[PDB]
């Protein structure tokens, strides 16, 4: 069970009418831990955590401010290289971070950039593991965060499911299975019919707004053979697989 800590980076160019901007985000798994904008005075750190009383986000803050100011000198010269005339607006997005874990022993450092939504070469590989260089405090800062917010981070929130019927004019009903409250965003929602998997409409998993997630699976069933259908819910937070046959 390893954990992640990736930083996001969005820089936008403002052609000769001021300057470009940016805004980085900090994610420790499926949780937003940090936020920071152009010329802001300090990054936004999740309250739930143990909140810096001497918590070395001073480390993070330094790195982000000096690393975030590498848009106006990474974008600009990137709009200059490509010669897309520095008249329109263009964007570059930087992303780093790792996926550590001690007891399993192993690191992994990440770093790729994209110009106007296209992968640019960085020459460094990808599985290149790891330990004035944020690439050295990755696993460290990571093993700190988990200690500041062990209630959300080290936390597996199970889903609450419930189906819903919508018998339509034509004579066909549509059965939809819902999955709410869960953390993390990995879940495997399926619809079947006597053990057989219906090889079914649905939605990408989406944010509820507080930390939990949502999603639903759907099929148009002939109103009469709807008791032979069932929906399974599997998540890391559940003790045993879920087989809700229309909510009983």
């Amino acid at each position: 069970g390893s954990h992640s800590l990736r930083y996001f980076y969005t820089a936008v160019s403002r052609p000769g009418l001021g300057e470009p901007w940016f805004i980085i985000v900090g994610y420790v798994d499926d949780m937003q831990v940090l936020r920071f904008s152009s010329k802001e005075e300090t990054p936004r750190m999740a309250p739930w955590l143990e909140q810096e009383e001497a918590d070395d986000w001073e480390q993070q803050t330094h790195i982000v401010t000096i690393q975030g100011q590498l848009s106006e000198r990474n974008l600009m010269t990137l709009v200059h290289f490509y010669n897309k005339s520095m008249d329109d607006s263009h964007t570059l997005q930087w992303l780093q971070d790792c996926d550590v874990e001690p007891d399993r022993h192993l690191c992994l450092w990440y770093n790729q950039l994209a110009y106007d939504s296209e992968d640019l070469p960085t020459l460094s590989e990808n599985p290149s593991s790891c330990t004035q260089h944020l690439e050295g405090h990755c696993s460290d800062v990571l093993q700190k965060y988990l200690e500041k917010g062990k209630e959300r981070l080290l936390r597996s929130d199970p889903p609450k499911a419930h189906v819903t019927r919508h018998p339509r004019p034509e004579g066909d009903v549509t059965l939809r299975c819902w999955a709410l409250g869960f953390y993390p965003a990995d879940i495997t929602l399926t619809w079947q019919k006597d053990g057989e998997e219906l090889t079914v409409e649905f939605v990408e998993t989406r944010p509820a707004g507080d930390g939990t997630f949502q999603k639903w699976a759907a099929v148009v069933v002939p109103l009469g053979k709807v008791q032979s259908y069932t929906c399974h819910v599997d998540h890391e937070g559940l003790p045993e697989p879920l087989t809700l046959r229309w909510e009983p």
């Binding site: 996001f8 969005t10 936008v12 805004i23 985000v25 994610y27 937003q32 936020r35 607006s89 964007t91 997005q93 992303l95 994209a114 106007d116 939504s117 296209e118 419930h162 819903t164 919508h166 939809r176 709410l180 939605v203 990408e204 989406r206 944010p207 509820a208 707004g209 507080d210 949502q214 639903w216």
Partner: protein, 99 residues
């Protein structure tokens, strides 16, 4: 060059007339960042809307979540109104109380 978004309108919880909640509009799979999403109430644009910080998917496509607390009513009709520099005109998705 210009990815166009995927609009969805939902509720943070099962909608029940007469109870506090949250109305979400999730926009994603779009690029450039320049977006403009409004939440409507019976055709009228709600005044106070909140939004999440701009993060970008694994494929460089930007995603945002806009919201606001609200108290669903069986008669009141809500919707999301979105505009991108790719669309020839504002698109409108109507919220389903059963989606």
């Amino acid at each position: 060059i210009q990815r166009t978004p995927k609009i969805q309108v939902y509720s943070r919880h099962p909608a029940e007339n007469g109870k506090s909640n949250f109305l979400n509009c999730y926009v994603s799979g779009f690029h450039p960042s320049d977006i403009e999403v409004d939440l409507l109430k019976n055709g009228e644009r709600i005044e106070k809307v909140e939004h999440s910080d701009l993060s970008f998917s694994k494929d460089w496509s930007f995603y945002l979540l806009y919201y606001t607390e609200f108290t669903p009513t069986e008669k009141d009709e809500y919707a999301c109104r979105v505009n991108h520099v790719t669309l020839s005109q504002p698109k409108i998705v109507k919220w389903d109380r059963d989606m």
